Design a binder for these strands. Structure first.
Ligand code: K
Ligand code: K
Ligand code: K
Ligand code: K
Ligand code: K
Ligand code: MG
Ligand code: MG
Ligand code: MG
Ligand code: MG
Ligand code: MG
Ligand code: MG
Ligand code: MG
Ligand code: MG
Ligand code: MG
Ligand code: MG
Ligand code: MG
Ligand code: MG
Ligand code: MG
Ligand code: MG
Ligand code: MG
Ligand code: MG
Ligand code: MG
Lengths: 134, 103, 88, 88, 124
RNA sequence: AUUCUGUGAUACCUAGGGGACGGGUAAAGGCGAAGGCAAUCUUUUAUGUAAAAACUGACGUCGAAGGACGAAGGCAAAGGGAACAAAAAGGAUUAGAUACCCCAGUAGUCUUUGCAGACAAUUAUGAAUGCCAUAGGUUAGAUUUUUAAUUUAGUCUAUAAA
């Protein structure tokens, strides 16, 4: 029966090469199945629009949201460039100042994401601990 | 026969020192280096007898010492192999990749 | 995020190395051989296989080079139409 | 945790765990990509000596233009093949 | 329970390897100079590789490949030893310890401003 | 090499104290008369920009002098002192080496109050007004059939007439 397991491996292998999610109503031509189209030359998962305008919220008024701060910093606590956020310069400055305020006020870490957010993310039982040592 | 050769780049290791980097060598270069080591050990040995077989038999005896592992050429093979392992990182040294890219 | 700029007038629009200057395919094999000698030793038996692979390199012929890439010819056709001009 | 407290330090953010679909060799590759995207190595090189404000401002202008010129050059190279494909 | 640590500090001129207990008490704190490498021979990639292999060997003698069930690898600095020692743990020497690794951390020290550094050197 | 270390260093930690500095964001980006101004909260201050109306009704521009402001270094006084670092000094390199490099290191940089007024204080381009054809970016708004165009005020790139 082991000969059936390797088939599942070969199947999922090809499924990884089909770098496209078909949806209902999507029109396709014989060209949309060739490698040039499946390769996905686009090396960037660009954002559609400025979410700050689409969600219509003032960043500075939402500085107390720990999840919102961790969303606009890298795992190392560094504010994300406008390339990753896809925001206008005006909205980028409001979200950057919203992160600096939370970190400056001392309610959010500066070199990683909030501890309570790390408790939920994968690697919960593996988080670095502090042995009392005494 | 060794498997690598040590090429040096002039003035790229520091204060006028060279950057030694190993590289592979084809068969003819491997056999040529090997047999020339054997002849180097042969010429330095003393004379034994007389006749037309002096040089021939003196070389053949060294060929046997090599197969038995008791020859001196085995040291020269391991000596050059050490330089290769001791410099395997120079293949990507900053000097070998920054010749004229620091205007 | 802004879009790519329109290049200023250049003397010539071209890429330095049109064809990818691929690396000798065996310099990677030698590194593996040099890696075993550091961990398993020189006169060991484990490295007896990698050495055979290294000896197999030089006994094989060198692949022939690919035809030149005509990218630079087409870049020179669309320079004035793609940039702000051409410097004299 | 309730019994032991988490060690909150800069290394806590630069941590990558080993799991089923990610082994030690896989966590190293992920650690290198994130350490590169965050330019940790560049900061260690820039923080080794002091650069007064004027020199830092002028160094950024030179590097920021080479980045726009390079980005605008890749757009012209690929725009040339969009036209060549059409047959122009 | 916190794992053991395998700190690997490496800079331009030397590399330090420290194996600590869960409470971060050093068990094996060695450097390239402990193997006899003198003033300038400590910066070589090869010398950092032998230090890694030496530490791994000394761990076996202490019977740590059986005592250590969870271990963390902490990297500090971008010297030659950062890659050399990794190929020891990832190679044939760390065969016994490779299975007990659960984390891979980077502890390179950066300053957000901080004290002023040396003035730039004029080598020419 | 001087130098640090068996009076236990480097490395790895725990617990306290101190001083400055300001990572990412960040851009051809912005602000001010210029000098200059980049972590954060509250408090506080004059200009400037867009669109509509309303209001005053030439109330404008330039401006010797006087006064004010004016980078870094410096003087004076009282603090601070981690780091950096003129001076002084040591170790190297060198034909010689004050030097470039290195081990260390005092003024000084920082705080408060005055003095001082010289700068590649630069756009090597005083301020202001009327006017002259386009194109491609970018910054802050406004209008719209908010897709994208149109438009006001900035800034930069490449050109026409000149
Ligand atoms: K040591
Ligand atoms: K200025
Ligand atoms: K000093
Ligand atoms: K001297
Ligand atoms: K414009
Ligand atoms: Mg004869
Ligand atoms: Mg100095
Ligand atoms: Mg010189
Ligand atoms: Mg002590
Ligand atoms: Mg402080
Ligand atoms: Mg900054
Ligand atoms: Mg203004
Ligand atoms: Mg006036
Ligand atoms: Mg006057
Ligand atoms: Mg002053
Ligand atoms: Mg002063
Ligand atoms: Mg004083
Ligand atoms: Mg000052
Ligand atoms: Mg005055
Ligand atoms: Mg000035
Ligand atoms: Mg005037
Ligand atoms: Mg500007």
């Amino acid at each position: 029966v082991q000969e059936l397991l390797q088939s599942e491996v070969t199947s999922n292998n090809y499924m990884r090469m089909m770098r496209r999610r078909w949806n209902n109503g999507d029109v396709y031509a014989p060209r949309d199945l060739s490698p040039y189209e499946m390769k996905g030359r686009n090396g960037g998962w660009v954002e559609a629009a400025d979410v700050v305008d689409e969600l219509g919220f003032s960043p500075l008024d939402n500085y107390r949201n720990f999840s919102l701060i961790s969303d606009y910093i890298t795992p190392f606590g560094r504010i994300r460039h406008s390339k990753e956020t896809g925001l206008k310069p005006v909205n980028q400055r409001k979200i950057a100042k919203m992160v600096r305020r939370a970190i400056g006020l001392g309610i959010h870490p500066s070199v990683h994401k909030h501890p309570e957010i790390l408790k939920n993310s994968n690697g919960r039982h593996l988080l670095p601990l502090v042995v009392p040592k005494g | 026969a060794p498997l690598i050769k040590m090429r040096g780049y002039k003035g790229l290791a520091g204060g006028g020192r060279s950057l030694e980097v190993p590289q592979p060598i084809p068969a003819r270069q491997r056999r040529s280096t090997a047999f020339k080591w054997i002849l180097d050990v042969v010429n330095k040995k003393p004379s034994k007898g007389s006749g037309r077989t002096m040089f021939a038999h003196r070389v053949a005896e060294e060929i046997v010492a090599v197969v038995e592992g008791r020859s001196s050429v085995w040291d020269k093979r391991m000596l050059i192999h050490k330089l290769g392992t001791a410099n395997r990182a120079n293949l990507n040294s900053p000097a070998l990749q920054l010749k004229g890219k620091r205007f | 995020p802004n879009k790519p700029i329109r290049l200023p007038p250049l003397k010539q629009l071209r890429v330095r190395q049109a064809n990818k200057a691929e690396e000798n395919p065996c310099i990677a094999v030698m590194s593996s051989v040099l890696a075993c000698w550091a961990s398993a030793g020189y006169n060991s038996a484990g490295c007896a296989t990698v050495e055979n692979a290294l000896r197999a390199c030089m006994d094989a012929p060198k692949p022939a080079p690919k035809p030149n890439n005509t990218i630079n010819y087409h870049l020179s056709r669309f320079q004035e139409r793609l940039t702000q001009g051409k410097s004299k | 945790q309730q019994e032991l407290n988490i060690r909150l330090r800069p290394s806590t953010g630069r941590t990558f765990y080993v799991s089923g679909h990610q082994d030690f060799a896989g966590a190293l590759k992920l650690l290198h990509r994130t350490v590169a995207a965050n330019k940790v190595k560049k900061d260690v090189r820039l923080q080794r000596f002091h650069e007064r404000p004027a020199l830092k401002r002028k160094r950024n202008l030179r590097e920021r233009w080479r980045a726009r010129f390079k980005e605008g050059f890749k757009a012209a190279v690929n725009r040339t093949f969009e036209l060549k494909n059409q047959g122009w | 329970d916190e794992p053991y640590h395998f700190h690997i500090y490496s800079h331009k001129h030397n590399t330090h390897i420290t194996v600590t207990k869960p409470n971060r008490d050093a068990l094996i704190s060695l450097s390239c100079g402990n193997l006899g490498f003198k003033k300038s021979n400590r910066k070589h990639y090869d010398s950092a590789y032998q230090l890694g292999a030496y530490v791994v060997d000394k761990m076996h003698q202490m019977n740590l490949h059986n005592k250590i069930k969870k271990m963390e690898v902490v990297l500090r600095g971008f010297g030659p030893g950062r890659e050399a020692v990794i190929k020891v743990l990832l190679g044939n020497e760390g065969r016994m310890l490779r299975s007990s690794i659960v984390r891979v951390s980077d502890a390179t020290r950066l300053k957000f401003g901080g004290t002023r550094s040396k003035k730039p050197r004029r080598l020419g």
